[PDB]
Design an enzyme around this catalytic site. Structure first.
Site, short mmCIF file in Angstrom:
data_model
loop_
_atom_site.label_atom_id
_atom_site.label_comp_id
_atom_site.label_asym_id
_atom_site.label_seq_id
_atom_site.Cartn_x
_atom_site.Cartn_y
_atom_site.Cartn_z
N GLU C 60 0.82 -1.20 0.00
CA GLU C 60 0.00 0.00 0.00
C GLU C 60 0.86 1.26 0.00
OE1 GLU C 60 -0.27 1.35 3.78
OE2 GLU C 60 -2.44 1.67 3.78
N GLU C 137 7.35 5.86 10.46
CA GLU C 137 5.95 5.89 10.85
C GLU C 137 5.62 4.92 11.97
OE1 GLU C 137 3.33 5.39 7.57
OE2 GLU C 137 3.84 7.32 6.64
#
Ligand code: HEM
Ligand code: HEM
Lengths: 60, 51, 446, 99, 379, 78
Positions: C60, C137
């Site tokens: 993704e 992240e």
């Protein structure tokens, strides 16, 4: 297939009111059963000594 | 006491009546067992064997 | 003078058609000049093993970074030049890519979605850059206490099962992932029978079907060397995971019990019961007068900054419970009140609160399905999970069926004398021990 | 007629003698406590001083001078509107609870 | 550093309870009786423990043992009559205390009041069991009369009465049991008193006015300690006047004739504290009705907080309620006299009317009068 | 319920002389006696009346009981 213990849980143990009903009825029947059994055990262990065993010979 | 005379309180009473009845049954059985109430117990099978 | 029933009847109906390869094309048509077209794929962390966990998040990440037909900048340039918004979301059970765009731009949106889904370059240099980004992240998400607590909840509740794995995945896997693994993930999990192309707004179903046949036809559902992934039911384990970090300002606690799957009819009554329990945040205006007893008590005593009830559902299992952020010294009281509300719903639920919960659920359902993005998301997820888009009329009928008796029965089945799963973060010393929390799950009176 | 008997009771009850007003003598139940916390500061301070003075007078078993006794007409029911509002709101909450 | 009184745990408890407790400045001498009740409890415990060192509970040796305490034991008579009259002082203080609670609306402290009712029942049981211990004619026959009241209870009845008696009638077993229960109960009272004080401290002390006194609070130690000491000195004045000048004023003479199960005493009456309930019991002809009325006389106090219909806590600013309260006090005096006097034509109707008036005043007249007062005050 | 935070009071000033600088019994009789008479006057009207009834009842009951015990001449007449 529900097991015996699962059936016991669902029918009686789940709701504490039925749990206490089980506890009390079992208490009554267990008092009866255990008293009977242990009295039999002790009477057998001392068969022929206890007065109850020999009361007939002297009564009447 | 007027506060508890409403439909929702009636519903709560309906919900808790079975549990209250079960607690009453527990109390009655406990009383009979603890006091060995022969009036009730004598009718109970295999417990009537006592007395 | 339309009525709620008439308005439900007049809602545009979703049309579902299937390409021969197995892709399902679903559409809801409205007069809006904007449309949302997205591909929902039945791939997620739950379908990943230990070695490849986090692969879906990686794909993704690099999904929009280039395709063989159009290099990395080209795709973004097209999407922005036509004014569309391209977005993706990955969950433990689903992965989605959707493009918000004008209705007149639907063919180009379908072309770009097909290119993203099928002809993804997965170039190695982009792979390294996205590895760096993903590690950064993962460091960032550690700050988000709520996500951390929910990940802990999944880990403890579904321990030993694929569902425990996080969507992002362990950092070690992220650093160790390779192009071969990402390609294998795309091949194994991205398949036509497991994908749904959904549209909402000004989309004609015939046009969408023709475009899908033009662009999505090539994608196949055959598995190389007859290697077919198998769905695995996941065990729910009553457990407690407590990360005690007293430095953290406020304590996050999430407690859940095993819940129904997506298709279980019990989901509606449980949703009504959770609506009865309600949600509270310190910003809420209602405060003390709020109907929810837990919310009123928290406002009056300032017990918790925020408390919310969640009904997280997966195919065969789900997490049903609440998440509350509270001070170090208020965790025990909040737990007491939450479990008390659970048991009160289980044992002595009443019709009026049931009506309030049913109306809350109806309004939530109607409001959520507003706008092309939510409607398209609903279409795709419903097709993947329910196999069909349940119409709002059917939802309303099922909600109407719910009564105090139904709520009591379902809440007793799922909430009463059931071992809970608890996750704690922060100053959680006052959080009750698992034996005490489990004892709270039943009432000696009942 | 009735006002005469009402005046008799006002004098018979000694809260006038101690300098108090009728609302000062009310039993502080939860509604009364909420009403007291809802009072304007001037009224609240006046009430606190009146009750303090009454307590001090009772402590020494003394009564206020006759001229300084409260007057039946001059007695003002400062707490009646706030207490009535509090009671009305409690009644509304109970009514919603009933059904 | 810190102040040891505040910091130390036991010293902290003592300080908060007695030294620096926030106390209303206007609480009058009627409030002194509770500390007088505690002093009476301590004095009774000490005196009864010194009596128990010389008292044997066998029916053969009980009366002779009390006579040994009176004659042979050094200062034993002082101790014995201190105990006897201290019981009366205890009951006088208890009645004045409950009267203060009723008159000044102290029953709004619900938990404290209910614990007090439990304490009252406990103290009455202790006194009744103690009176039997001397094993005089009056002790034996009063025990026979009172304990036989339990037989009225339907079904269980005779079983319970014989279980308490330890046999067919009052006898050696009853005396020994009562000595044991009499010894133990005062300590249970001493614990219930601590629970009482905890509940009271939660809500403070009410004032004669009946209006909250958080604005005017005075530290307990400097003022109320000295006030209680003065009250204790006055109580000692009265009690010692009874103990020395008139040792046998509040006691029936027939308790000096050793108990004879075969002969009833000329008159059987309870101690002065119990006479008011005795009159109520005699008023109702049916035995079970009499027993229930005797129970309700004390238990009506529990209903007092529920029956409070006035908007003012105290009766200070409620003249008609004051008149009703003093009517109730006079009625209790009348019941005491009727219990003293024989059950004959003049006294029977008096006692029946007095019991009806007591219950009517507590249950009906006072709440309606309070409502009327509320209406008069434009409430 | 500690002393510090009992209640909220504003703008009240209290002056209290020390015990050593003031007399223990100021006007104990000059002012005490008039105060006691005032208190008795108000209380007597309510406290007394009920007790007066008891004295009437006690006197009547004692007299009636004595009258009952006394012989009735008519019974032994004839
Ligand atoms: C605490 C409240 C108490 C009350 C109200 C109370 C009351 C009484 C009464 C009314 C009597 C009979 C008086 C008489 O001799 O004619 C008595 C006797 C007696 N009490 Fe106490 N009592 C109390 C505490 C105690 C305690 C704690 C003891 C511990 C030993 C005790 C030991 C005795 C003894 C040994 C007698 C019989 C000696 C005698 O007849 O002089 N009492 N009590
Ligand atoms: C041995 C028995 C008892 C003891 C030692 C005792 C002790 C005390 C004490 C020390 C106080 C503090 C206030 C004061 O001193 O007046 C008090 C207050 C109080 N007591 Fe008890 N008491 C006893 C029995 C009772 C009974 C029988 C009742 C009611 C049936 C009662 C109800 C109350 C109430 C309502 C208060 C509140 C006083 C206030 O408003 O300040 N007590 N008691």
């Amino acid at each position: 297939a529900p097991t015996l213990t699962a059936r016991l849980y669902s029918l009686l143990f789940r709701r504490t009111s039925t749990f206490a009903l089980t506890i009390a009825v079992g208490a009554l029947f267990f008092e009866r059963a255990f008293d009977q059994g242990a009295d039999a055990i002790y009477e057998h262990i001392n068969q022929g000594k206890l007065w109850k065993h020999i009361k007939h010979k002297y009564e009447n | 006491l007027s506060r508890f005379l409403g439909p929702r309180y009636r519903e709560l009473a309906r919900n808790w009546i079975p549990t209250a009845s079960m607690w009453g049954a527990v109390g009655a059985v406990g009383l009979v067992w603890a006091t060995d109430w022969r009036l009730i117990l004598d009718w109970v099978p295999y417990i009537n064997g006592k007395f | 003078t339309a009525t709620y029933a008439q308005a439900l009847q007049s809602v545009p109906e979703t049309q579902v058609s299937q390409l021969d390869n197995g892709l399902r094309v679903a559409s809801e048509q409205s007069s809006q000049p904007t449309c949302t077209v997205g591909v929902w794929i039945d791939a997620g962390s739950r379908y990943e093993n230990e070695k490849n966990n986090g692969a879906g998040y990686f794909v993704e990440h690099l999904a929009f970074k280039g395709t063989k037909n159009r290099p990395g900048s080209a795709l973004e340039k097209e999407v922005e030049s036509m004014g569309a918004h391209l977005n993706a979301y990955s969950t433990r059970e689903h992965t989605a890519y959707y493009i918000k765009a004008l209705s007149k731009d639907l063919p180009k949106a379908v072309e770009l979605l097909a290119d993203i889904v099928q002809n993804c370059s997965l170039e190695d240099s982009q792979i390294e850059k996205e590895r760096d980004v993903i590690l950064q992240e993962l460091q960032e998400n550690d700050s988000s206490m709520r996500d951390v607590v929910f990940d802990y909840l999944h880990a403890t509740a579904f321990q030993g099962t694929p569902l425990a794995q996080s969507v992002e995945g362990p950092s070690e896997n992220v650093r160790k992932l390779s192009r071969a693994d990402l390609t294998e993930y795309v091949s194994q999990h991205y398949k036509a029978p497991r994908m749904v192309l959904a549209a909402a707004g000004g989309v004609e179903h015939r046009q969408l079907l023709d475009l899908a046949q033009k662009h999505f036809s090539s994608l196949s559902g055959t598995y190389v060397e007859d290697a077919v992934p198998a769905f695995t039911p996941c065990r729910f384990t009553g457990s407690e995971i407590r990360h005690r970090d007293d430095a953290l300002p406020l304590a996050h606690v999430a407690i859940a019990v095993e819940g129904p799957g997506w298709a279980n009819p019990d989901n509606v009554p449980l949703q009504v019961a959770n609506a009865i329990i309600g949600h509270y945040d310190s910003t809420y205006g209602g405060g003390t007068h709020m109907s929810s007893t837990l919310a009123s008590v928290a406002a009056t005593r300032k017990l918790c900054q925020s408390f919310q009830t969640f009904n997280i559902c997966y195919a065969e299992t789900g997490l049903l419970g609440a998440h509350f952020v509270c001070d170090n010294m208020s965790i025990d009281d909040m737990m007491f009140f939450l479990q008390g509300q659970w048991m009160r719903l289980c044992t002595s639920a009443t019709e009026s609160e049931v009506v309030r919960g049913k109306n809350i659920l109806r309004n939530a359902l109607v409001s959520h399905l507003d706008g092309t993005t939510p409607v398209c998301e609903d279409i795709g997820r419903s097709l993947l999970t329910y196999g069909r888009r349940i119409p709002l009329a059917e939802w309303e009928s099922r909600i109407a069926e719910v009564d105090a008796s139904v709520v009591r029965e379902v809440c007793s089945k799922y909430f009463y004398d059931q071992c809970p799963a608890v996750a704690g973060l922060g100053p959680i010393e006052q959080l009750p021990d698992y034996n005490r929390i489990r004892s709270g799950m039943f009432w000696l009176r009942f | 007629w009735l006002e005469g008997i009402r005046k008799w009771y006002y004098n018979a009850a000694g809260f006038n003698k101690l300098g108090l007003m009728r609302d000062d003598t009310i039993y502080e139940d939860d509604d009364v406590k909420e009403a007291i916390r809802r009072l304007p500061e001037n009224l609240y301070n006046d009430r606190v001083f009146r009750i303090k003075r009454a307590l001090d007078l009772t402590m020494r078993q003394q009564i206020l001078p006759k001229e300084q006794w409260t007057k039946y007409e001059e007695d003002k029911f400062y707490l009646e509107p706030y207490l009535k509002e509090v009671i009305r709101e409690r009644k509304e909450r109970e009514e919603w609870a009933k059904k | 550093m810190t102040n040891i009184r505040k910091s130390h745990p036991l010293m902290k408890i003592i300080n908060n309870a007695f030294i620096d407790l926030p106390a209303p400045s206007n609480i009058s001498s009627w409030w002194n009786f509770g500390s007088l009740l505690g002093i009476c409890l301590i004095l009774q415990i000490l005196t009864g423990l010194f009596l128990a060192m010389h008292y044997t509970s066998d029916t053969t040796t009980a009366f002779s043992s009390v006579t040994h305490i009176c004659r042979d034991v050094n200062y034993g008579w002082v101790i014995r009559y201190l105990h006897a009259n201290g019981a009366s002082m205890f009951f006088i203080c208890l009645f004045i205390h409950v009267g203060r609670g009723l008159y000044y609306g102290s029953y709004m402290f619900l938990e404290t009041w209910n614990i007090g009712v439990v304490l009252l029942f406990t103290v009455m049981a202790t006194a009744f069991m103690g009176y039997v211990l001397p094993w005089g004619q009056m002790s034996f026959w009063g025990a026979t009369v009172i304990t036989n009241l339990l037989s009225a209870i339907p079904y269980i009845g005779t079983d319970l009465v014989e279980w308490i008696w330890g046999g067919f009638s009052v006898d050696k077993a009853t005396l020994t049991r009562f000595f044991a229960f009499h010894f133990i109960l005062p300590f249970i009272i001493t614990a219930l008193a601590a629970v009482h004080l905890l509940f009271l401290h939660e809500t403070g002390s009410n004032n004669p006015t009946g209006i909250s006194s958080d604005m005017d609070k005075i530290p307990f130690h400097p003022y109320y300690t000295i006030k209680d000491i003065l009250g204790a000195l006055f109580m000692m004045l009265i009690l010692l006047i009874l103990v020395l000048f008139s040792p046998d004023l509040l006691g029936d003479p027939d308790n000096y004739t050793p108990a004879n199960p075969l002969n009833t005493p000329p008159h059987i009456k309870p101690e002065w504290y119990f006479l008011f309930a005795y009159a109520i019991l005699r008023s109702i002809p049916n035995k079970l009705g009499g027993v229930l009325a005797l129970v309700a006389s004390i238990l009506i106090l529990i209903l007092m907080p529920m029956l409070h219909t006035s908007k003012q806590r105290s009766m200070m600013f409620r003249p008609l309620s004051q008149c009703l309260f003093w009517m109730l006090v006079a009625d209790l005096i009348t019941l005491t006299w009727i219990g003293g006097q024989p059950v004959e034509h003049p006294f029977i109707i008096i006692g029946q009317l007095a019991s009806i008036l007591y219950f009517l005043i507590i249950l009906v007249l006072m709440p309606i009068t309070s409502i009327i007062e509320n209406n008069l005050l434009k409430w | 319920r500690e002393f510090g935070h009992l209640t909220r009071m504003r703008h009240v000033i209290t002056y209290s002389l020390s015990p050593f600088e003031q007399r223990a019994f100021p006007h104990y009789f000059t002012k005490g006696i008039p105060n006691v008479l005032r208190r008795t006057r108000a209380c007597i009207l309510r406290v007394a009346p009920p007790f007066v009834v008891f004295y009437l009842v006690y006197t009547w009951g004692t007299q009636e009981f004595e009258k009952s015990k006394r012989k009735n001449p008519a019974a032994y007449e004839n």
